[PDB]
Amino acid sequence: KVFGRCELAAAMKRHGLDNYRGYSLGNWVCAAKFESNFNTQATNRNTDGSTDYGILQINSRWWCNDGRTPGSRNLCNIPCSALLSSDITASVNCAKKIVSDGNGMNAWVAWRNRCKGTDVQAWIRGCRL
Ligand SMILES: [Cl-]
Ligand SMILES: [Cl-]
Ligand code: NA
């Protein structure tokens, strides 16, 4: 599923991401835009052989099982395929764990490089939230 901007903002808000660990909704929307372009089916193979899955490009090294990332963990206790669903519940539940891991949203390199310090509120401009 390719979400609309305000559509994804509303889903993230409903799932309690708005100001989760002090990160405003625009941070989460910006992160999803540059990780997946709002596409739930996005996948990216990393150099280390792990894969990034779903709207927030959650990685198989620590967070989900794809059965092909040797020495990996499954800390969100989900198949990585669950992160590709049109329903973002699993992606959000797992992102809440990731962002609690101690580095906040710096865990998303695309958030650090493209969202951090910017006018993230622009990402929810115009939305009926
Ligand atoms: Cl957009
Ligand atoms: Cl594990
Ligand atoms: Na894994």
Buried b (16+ CB within 10 A) or exposed e, 1-34: eebebbebbbbbbebebbebeebbbbbbbbbbbe
Give the chain's domains with CATH numbers: 1-129 (1.10.530.10)
Residues 47-81 as b or e (16 or more Cβ within 10 Å = b): eeebbbbbbbbbbbbbbbbbeebeebebebebebe
CB 11 within 8 A of CB 4: no
Ligand nearest to the CA of 52: 3
How many angstroms is the resolution? 2.0
DSSP 127: -
Q: How far is the CA of 75 from the centre of ligand 1 (A)?
A: 31
Classified as helix, coil or strand, 23 is: strand
Report the 10 Å Cβ neighbour count for 45. 11
Which amino acids are annotated catalytic?
Answer: 35, 52
Q: Which of 129, 128, 112 has the alpha carbon at shortest distance from 27?
A: 112
Taken as a whole, the chain contains a residue count of 129
Q: Is 105 exposed, middle or buried (0-12, 13-18, 19+ CB in 10 A)?
A: buried
Residues of each annotated binding site for substrate: 101
How does strand 43-45 pair with strand 51-53? antiparallel
**Rounded CA gap, 29 and 47, in Å?**
26
Determine the residue type at 88.
Answer: I
CA of 125 to the centre of ligand 2 (A): 38
Compute φ and ψ for 27, nearest 5 degrees.
-60, -45
